[PDB]
Amino acid sequence: GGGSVTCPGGQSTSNSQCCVWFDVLDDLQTNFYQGSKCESPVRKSLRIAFHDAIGFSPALTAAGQFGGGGADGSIIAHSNIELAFPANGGLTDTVEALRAVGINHGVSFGDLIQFAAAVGMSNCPGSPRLEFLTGRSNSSQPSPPSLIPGPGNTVTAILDRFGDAGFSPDEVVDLLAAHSLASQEGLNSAIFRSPLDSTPQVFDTQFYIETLLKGTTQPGPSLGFAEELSPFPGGFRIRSDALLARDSRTACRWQSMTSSNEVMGQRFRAAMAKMSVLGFDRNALTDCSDVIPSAVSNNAAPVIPGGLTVDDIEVSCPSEPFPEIATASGPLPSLAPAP
Ligand code: HEM
Ligand SMILES: *[C@@H]1O[C@H](CO)[C@@H](O)[C@H](O)[C@H]1NC(C)=O
Ligand SMILES: *[C@@H]1O[C@H](CO)[C@@H](O)[C@H](O)[C@@H]1O
Ligand SMILES: *[C@H]1O[C@H](CO)[C@@H](O)[C@H](O)[C@@H]1O
Ligand SMILES: [Ca+2]
Ligand SMILES: [Ca+2]
């Protein structure tokens, strides 16, 4: 009930509580995203959205311990503690930028983190319009350690961690679609911002396709932590991604994610919707999704690049034949570092 309202700025929204977010939106797009760009800040933001929310463990709670508050913005309010975690390196600068936006505009760290991620993705072509709820308390307790899955973890360990959090193997695969807009800076400092897929600025299925290709080249002088050979020069491949793409428990869902950008988009949206509210009752929050702008549509079709073919794909789903995917001519492409 209530009805649509008009904000002070003339914008139309579903609830009055959404109005303050239009100010944050202008701030982020203007400053943080340096003109609504899809570069490092967007990737850092998405990474932070995950690392804040994932600090939620029903298992710890069942053992009589604090299991973490989930998407409570603890990674910021307790950055001194959480940024010490193995998986939270290279986030400090982004955390400080977000801390200031939240403090000034007066929005909670929890809400802001999920907001920034949704807004950031709208700057990258092909991205779906993520759900955005507001109303998370700004208060939090530091996240317990060892709750973030690591690149060197076995699939069994990764599935267990996510399972505890509330995600099925299929959902973990869906969640990894975020690596379609990713690079690494801390695994191998020798090759700064080496992309995970051939399109670090396009939310597409390229990540799922290329991760299944045979690893043939080494991007840098030496291998970094949890690094595997990749298919293209300049490209990077995380061990956990390589394993998940080929493990019988996740192989078919991963393969199903290669030919359809639309299917990928909603799967990621649904999985993200659940992650963004870990540690909260979504019914206690307010839906402000209409604040999130739409992104440019991706008209490029999925493809096996560089002259490689299905024969270069290490098909891991025994029950389904690899989908029909276009191929290309020209040589093997050299991937430039993500912007
Ligand atoms: C299942 C396990 C997952 C593992 C082991 C994992 C691991 C990693 C690692 C080691 C990096 C490189 C960090 C660096 O050295 O700069 C990375 C990057 C990234 N990850 Fe994941 N990740 C996982 C899931 C996710 C999820 C669920 C999301 C968000 C919805 C996400 C979003 C990102 C983004 C956007 C980057 C790129 C950062 C950049 O370009 O700066 N990841 N991830
Ligand atoms: C949220 O908490 C931080 C300290 O953890 C504080 O600096 C900030 O002003 C708070 N934000 C709001 C909206 O009260
Ligand atoms: C991709 O394109 C190349 C060159 O046309 C073929 O060799 C391959 O079979 C696939 O069609
Ligand atoms: C091919 O060229 C790109 C830059 O255009 C590099 O990033 C890659 O490592 C390889 O030298
Ligand atoms: Ca948290
Ligand atoms: Ca991509």
Same domain, 315 and 200: yes
Structure token pair of residue 16: 């009055």
Same domain, 31 and 130: yes
Same domain, 172 and 221: yes
Name the strand (E) or helix (H) holding 60.
helix 58-62
Closest ligand to residue 279's CA: 5
- Is residue 95 within 6 Å of ligand 2 at its C-beta? no
Quick one: resolution in A? 2.0
Q: Which residues contact 282 (CB under 8 A, 6 or more apart)?
A: 133
Rounded CA separation 227/232 (Å): 14
Same domain, 39 and 113: yes
Residue whose pair of structure tokens reads 């267990």 in the numeric block: 160
Judge contact between 87 and 148, C-beta under 8 A.
Answer: yes
Residue 71 lies in a domain: yes
Q: Is residue 194 classed as helix, strand or coil in its secondary structure? A: strand
Residue 44 lies in a domain: yes
User: What CATH number is attached to the domain comprising 79?
Assistant: 1.10.520.10
Same domain, 55 and 69: yes
Query: Within a 10 A sphere around the Cβ of 168, how many other Cβ atoms?
Result: 13
Residue bearing the CA closest to ligand 2, atom 4: 77
Residue 266 lies in a domain: yes
Structure token pair of residue 237: 């491949």
Distance 32 CA to ligand 2 centre (A): 19
Same domain, 306 and 294: no
- Is residue 152 within 6 Å of ligand 2 at its C-beta? no
Closest ligand to residue 244's CA: 1
Judge contact between 317 and 251, C-beta under 8 A.
Answer: yes
Same domain, 305 and 293: no
Residue 6 lies in a domain: no
78 is catalytic: no
DSSP state of 286: E
How many folded domains does the chain comprise?
2
Residue 2 lies in a domain: no
Rounded CA separation 149/241 (Å): 12
Residue 1 lies in a domain: no
What range defines the domain where residue 32 resides? 15-148+272-299
Same domain, 286 and 328: no
Pairing of strands 326-327, 303-304: parallel
Of 43, 44, 51, 267, which is the active-site residue?
51
Rounded CA separation 277/132 (Å): 10
| Helix and strand numbers, DSSP H then E, in the chain | 13, 10
Rounded CA separation 197/220 (Å): 16
User: What CATH number is attached to the domain comprising 253?
Assistant: 1.10.420.10
- Is residue 138 within 6 Å of ligand 2 at its C-beta? yes
Residue bearing the CA closest to ligand 2, atom 5: 77
Q: Which of 78, 104, 109 to mutate to test the pocket of ligand 2 (most atoms within 8 A of CB)?
A: 109
Same domain, 159 and 284: no
The amino acid that residue 69 corresponds to is G
Structure determination method: X-ray
Judge contact between 23 and 109, C-beta under 8 A.
Answer: no
- Is residue 112 within 6 Å of ligand 2 at its C-beta? no
- Is residue 103 within 6 Å of ligand 2 at its C-beta? yes
* Closest approach atom of ligand 3 to CA 329: 4
Distance 220 CA to ligand 4 centre (A): 10
Q: Exposed/middle/buried for 27, CB within 10 Å: 0-12, 13-18, 19+? A: middle
Distance 333 CA to ligand 4 centre (A): 9
Torsion, Cα of 195, 201, 205, 209 (10° steps): -20
Same domain, 167 and 311: yes
Rounded CA separation 290/17 (Å): 12
Same domain, 330 and 284: no
* Closest approach atom of ligand 2 to CA 108: 13
Q: Which of 43, 47, 274 to mutate to test the pocket of ligand 1 (most atoms within 8 A of CB)?
A: 47
Same domain, 58 and 125: yes
